[PDB]
Amino acid sequence: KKPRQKRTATKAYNVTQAFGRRGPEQTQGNFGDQELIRQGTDYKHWPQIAQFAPSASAFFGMSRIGMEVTPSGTWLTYTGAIKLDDKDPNFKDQVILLNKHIDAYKTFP
Amino acid sequence: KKPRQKRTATKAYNVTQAFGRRGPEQTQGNFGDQELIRQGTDYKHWPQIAQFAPSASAFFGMSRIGMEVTPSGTWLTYTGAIKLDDKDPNFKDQVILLNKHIDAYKTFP
Ligand SMILES: O=C(/C=C/c1ccc(O)c(O)c1)O[C@@H](C(=O)O)[C@@H](OC(=O)/C=C/c1ccc(O)c(O)c1)C(=O)O
Ligand code: NA
């Protein structure tokens, strides 16, 4: 199996299997409704989500990168923000799609 | 020009041009020494850095994702942490390489 950061979720290997249960904790993933969790990149609107994912160059160019050495190991930390184009005619639908998946786990077991 | 998150830095379109100068503010990237800044993905050790960058699936699976509406526009926020494999024979070289680039800008004239 690939390193966690290189994994690709699909119906055969879903978001929970690849990335763990969604939840509220720092360094727990919070993104995905039940349909996306189950289907990963097989999700019918995956392209409209993936348009916001950074290239490796942009991940290392845009982000605040840190390194932490703790009792669990050595961790590369990252924070950043990606600006949506509010002049894109698809902007309202993009906001609706992203909001549908952000913290969706709070509404189901 | 591509949306910022899809840009690829190269010798012709470098990290400063693609992603802005390195600096300490939360809106700036902090990653890259003078050689990676000038070369982007032409950098001789780029693969050893890119191995830590998340797939589109992992970026949305591992990260804490948010949406912030501020005076400057609408932002998709991301945070998370990637564990190094201390059983990787290249672990000690990965630590040295990441230490060369994190906040390297502090040493520039
Ligand atoms: O990267 C740039 C911009 C380059 C550029 C612009 C327009 C062009 O048309 C072009 O071809 C290139 O400069 C910086 C910026 O903007 O302040 C960028 O600095 C550096 O890496 C400098 C490092 C350094 C290290 C050791 C030294 O001894 C020394 O003298 C300098 C940063 O700190 O992020
Ligand atoms: Na160290």
Numbering used by the authors:
A (entry chain BBB), B (entry chain AAA): 256 to 364
Manuscript excerpt for this entry:
The NTD is implicated in the binding and melting of regulatory elements required for transcription initiation, whereas the CTD drives protein dimerization and is thought to contribute to the binding of the RNA packaging signal (PS) sequence during virus particle assembly.
Complementary orthogonal biophysical methods, including isothermal titration calorimetry (ITC), 1H-saturation transfer difference (STD) and 1H15N-HSQC NMR experiments, further revealed that CA binds to the CTD. CA binds to a shallow pocket (volume of ~ 190 A3 ) formed between α-helices 1–2 and η-helix 2, close to the C-terminus. The CA molecule bound to one of the CTD protomers was unambiguously found by inspecting the 2Fo–Fc electron-density map. A close inspection of the structural complex shows that the binding of CA to the CTD is stabilized mainly by polar contacts of the carboxylate and carbonyl groups from CA’s tartarate and caffeoyl units, involving Arg276/Arg277 and three structural water molecules. The structure of the complex also shows one CA catechol ring laid inside a hydrophobic canyon formed by η-helix 2, α-helix 2 and the last two C-terminus residues (Phe363 and Pro364). When the apo and complexed structures were superposed, we observed no significant changes in the overall structures, as judged by the Cα RMSD (0.19 Å deviation). Arg276 had moved outwards, positioning its guanidine group at ideal distances to form electrostatic (NH1) and water-mediated (NH2) hydrogen-bond interactions with CA’s carboxylate group.
